[PDB]
Design a protein around this ligand. Structure first.
Ligand code: CA
Lengths: 224, 55
């Protein structure tokens, strides 16, 4: 998260870290056994880390739960990043408490101008590398489709949207993929891609969670 | 040394943080960098040993 601030300790209780020996992506806990993340965060083995704030330090609230199933969207397209979404079923239930809880699924598509919170342990530098220990937060608005399209002509599908600032300086970055974009207590996005981080006229592109509601219901059902 | 070993490392547009290896030509060794998750160029290896072998 470039241009963000330390989130208060455990103020984003739905945020997860995905770990393969080190933190590689984010995710969102959407029920006691399921996490949503991006498709390009796929790996065949993943440890899900919930209730984290500082990913370097065992604070005493963390639950470290293996991924029992890892189900990328079957029409995920590695070249265009269309359908950049993935579900992870945890091997056990997350213990819901004050540092770990779920975020609701969206009930309507993102609405332009809405102020959203984006979170992650990704790079905080727009050039070079400054990866933080503490979870980073950033307030940013949903951009119109016209702006999104002008920023990435021919590259935006109806499954993507843009959140951020055309003037640059504030954006999600490497290490933030899969994490949440949350607006008025609903999960509207998954950090997906962009041209650089925090560059002018290049806001982050985010997967449009609302479009995957049914797929998520059905995948959950078929694996319950 | 294939000529692709001379490319700067390429993060790509995806926002994962995947530790990969690349040949740094000047420094004459395999080094770590952050790969974003999609659109890999060839100077991008999954271990140091692979990198050292090709480059
Ligand atoms: Ca911790």
């Amino acid at each position: 998260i470039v241009g963000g601030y330390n989130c208060e300790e455990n103020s984003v209780p739905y945020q997860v870290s995905l770990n393969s020996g080190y933190h590689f992506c984010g995710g969102s806990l959407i029920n006691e056994q399921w996490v949503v993340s991006a498709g390009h965060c796929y790996k065949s083995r993943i440890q899900v880390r919930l209730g984290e704030h500082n990913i370097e330090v065992l604070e005493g609230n963390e639950q470290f739960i293996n991924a029992a199933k890892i189900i990328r969207h079957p029409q995920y397209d590695r070249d265009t990043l269309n359908n950049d979404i993935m579900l992870i079923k945890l091997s056990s239930r997350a213990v819901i408490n004050a540092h770990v809880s779920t975020i609701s699924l969206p009930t309507a598509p993102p609405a332009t101008g809405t102020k959203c919170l984006i979170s992650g342990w990704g790079n905080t530098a727009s050039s070079g590398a400054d990866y933080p220990d503490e979870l980073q937060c950033l307030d940013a608005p949903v951009l119109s489709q016209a702006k999104c399209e002008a920023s990435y002509p021919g590259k935006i599908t109806s499954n993507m949207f843009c959140v951020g600032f055309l003037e640059g300086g504030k954006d999600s970055c490497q290490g933030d993929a899969g994490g949440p974009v949350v607006c008025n207590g609903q999960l509207q996005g998954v950090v997906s891609w962009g041209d650089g981080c925090a560059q002018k006229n290049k806001p982050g592109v985010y997967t449009k969670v609302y479009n995957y509601v049914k797929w998520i219901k059905n995948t959950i059902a078929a694996n319950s | 040394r294939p000529d692709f070993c001379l490319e700067p490392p390429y993060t790509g547009p995806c926002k994962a943080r995947i530790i990969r290896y690349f040949y740094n030509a000047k420094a004459g060794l395999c080094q770590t960098f952050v790969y974003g998750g999609c659109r890999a160029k060839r100077n991008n290896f999954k271990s140091a040993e692979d990198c050292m072998r090709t480059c």
